Amino acid sequence: DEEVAALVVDNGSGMCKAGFAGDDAPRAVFPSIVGRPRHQGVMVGMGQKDSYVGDEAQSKRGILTLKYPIEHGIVTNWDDMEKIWHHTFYNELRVAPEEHPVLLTEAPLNPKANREKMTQIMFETFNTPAMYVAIQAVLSLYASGRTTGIVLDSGDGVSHTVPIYEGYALPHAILRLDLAGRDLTDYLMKILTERGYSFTTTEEREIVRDIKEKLCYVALDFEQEMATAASSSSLEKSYELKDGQVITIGNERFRCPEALFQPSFLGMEACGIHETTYNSIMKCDVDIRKDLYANTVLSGGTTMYPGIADRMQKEITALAPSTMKIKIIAPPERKYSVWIGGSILASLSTFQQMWISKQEYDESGPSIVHRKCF
Numbered sequence: 001d002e003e004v005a006a007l008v009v010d011n012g013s014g015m016c017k018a019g020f021a022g023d024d025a026p027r028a029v030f031p032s033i034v035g036r037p038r039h040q041g042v043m044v045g046m047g048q049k050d051s052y053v054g055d056e057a058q059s060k061r062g063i064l065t066l067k068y069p070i071e072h073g074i075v076t077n078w079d080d081m082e083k084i085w086h087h088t089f090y091n092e093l094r095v096a097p098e099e100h101p102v103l104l105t106e107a108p109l110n111p112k113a114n115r116e117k118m119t120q121i122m123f124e125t126f127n128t129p130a131m132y133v134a135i136q137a138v139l140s141l142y143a144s145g146r147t148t149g150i151v152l153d154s155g156d157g158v159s160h161t162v163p164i165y166e167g168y169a170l171p172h173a174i175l176r177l178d179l180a181g182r183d184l185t186d187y188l189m190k191i192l193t194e195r196g197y198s199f200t201t202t203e204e205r206e207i208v209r210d211i212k213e214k215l216c217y218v219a220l221d222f223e224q225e226m227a228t229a230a231s232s233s234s235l236e237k238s239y240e241l242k243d244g245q246v247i248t249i250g251n252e253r254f255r256c257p258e259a260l261f262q263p264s265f266l267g268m269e270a271c272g273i274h275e276t277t278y279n280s281i282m283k284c285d286v287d288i289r290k291d292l293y294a295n296t297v298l299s300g301g302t303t304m305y306p307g308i309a310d311r312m313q314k315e316i317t318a319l320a321p322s323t324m325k326i327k328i329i330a331p332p333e334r335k336y337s338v339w340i341g342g343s344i345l346a347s348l349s350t351f352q353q354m355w356i357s358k359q360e361y362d363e364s365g366p367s368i369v370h371r372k373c374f
């Protein structure tokens with residue numbers, strides 16, 4: 001049916017995912033980074049590379065000063081963001097944007113002007129024939145095969161709880177929590193260095209991430225777990241640096257992600273992801289709360305810790321009404337569920353009328369995004 005393959009671009013704080021609508025996985029996934037040379041160029045006018053994007057900026061981070069154009073889920077540097085999209089189209093996907101409708105993602109509650117800037121860049125710089133900006137949380141719910149539920153999305157720069165009913169999101173019930181994977185990696189660095197090791201440099205942080213994504217987990221009960229670690233040596237695991245040396249980690253394994261439930265460990269006074277989810281549900285209309293409790297979906301890389309689903313189930317229960325059915329959904333590929341939701345949506349029949357056409361943009365201006373998107 002579809003005359004053209006739509007492109008799906010999920011921009012995140014740490015990783016951007018890109019691909020073609022219709023596919024079940026994104027073709028390209030790389031760091032949302034843009035780097036420039038630390039050292040001044042000796043010659044002028046010889047077209048040498050000035051800016052490095054994604055994996056190439058990573059494979060050369062040593063001689064570059066890196067920038068993250070997306071922080072806390074919000075675009076903060078539009079020149080570099082433009083570079084990431086240019087790189088996505090021409091370097092990763094090898095497509096000409098003017099030949100494809102492009103579906104992009106953004107975080108809820110983001111500045112109005114960013115939504116318009118995105119739309120302007122897509123039409124005036126890349127000349128796309130059509131485009132749309134959708135809320136990440138919503139695509140994740142869709143990828144789970146649901147139109148009803150509350151999504152807890154936790155990435156590298158931010159976390160949001162987004163209540164969704166019969167297909168649409170409830171704007172006023174959406175909550176934002178400035179605590180994500182980035183903060184967790186830094187915290188893991190800290191406590192491990194207190195264990196005796198020494199992780200302070202940027203080159204080190206990189207290995208502390210693998211540890212985190214592979215050795216960390218969410219204890220069902222923090223105190224019992226801490227007790228077991230202080231007496232029993234059964235919760236320790238091994239890890240080897242790039243020097244072949246092996247270093248064992250103990251309670252740090254579950255102490256790191258515990259910050260997700262007790263932000264005070266990071267000096268933050270915000271309430272954990274369980275309380276934030278509850279506060280969102282209670283911000284909803286009592287008539288639908290029951291529905292949300294039974295369809296709490298996990299989305300994003302930081303919700304990948306083993307044991308997080310069962311811990312969430314336990315925490316939410318103690319907060320919800322006794323006779324309130326609680327259920328946590330943890331899709332296996334929730335690391336790319338937002339991209340997958342986009343893939344699905346872009347192919348939907350009732351969604352086609354939603355795309356913002358070049359014609360609509362030409363007649364209504366940037367503000368068209370608010371009417372057709374939000």
Ligand SMILES: C=C1[C@@H](C)[C@H]2[C@H](Cc3ccccc3)NC(=O)[C@]23[C@H](OC(C)=O)/C=C/[C@@](C)(O)C(=O)[C@@H](C)C/C=C/[C@H]3[C@@H]1O
Pocket residue numbers: 133134135138139167168169170171350351354371372373374
């Ligand atoms: C993926 C998104 C859009 C496709 C809408 C989607 C429903 C939909 C699906 C197919 C065809 C038409 C409409 N579910 C939503 O929450 C959206 C939908 O947006 C539109 C235009 O319906 C919802 C809008 C509101 C006002 O309810 C919002 O919550 C608003 C603040 C944020 C935007 C949400 C939209 C979301 O980004």
Ligand SMILES: Nc1ncnc2c1ncn2[C@@H]1O[C@H](COP(=O)(O)OP(=O)(O)OP(=O)(O)O)[C@@H](O)[C@H]1O
Pocket residue numbers: 011012013014015016072073154155156157158159180181182209212213214299300301302303304305335
């Ligand atoms: N197995 C894992 N366990 C815990 N954390 C993980 C795991 N795998 C990846 N992460 C972390 O998830 C984060 C990346 O997730 P994701 O790509 O969803 O975020 P993002 O979209 O780039 O950023 P954001 O959505 O906050 O703007 C990183 O901190 C990564 O280290």
Ligand SMILES: [Ca+2]
Pocket residue numbers: 011012013136155300338
């Ligand atoms: Ca994201």
Ligand SMILES: [Ca+2]
Pocket residue numbers: 262263264268269270271
């Ligand atoms: Ca606290």
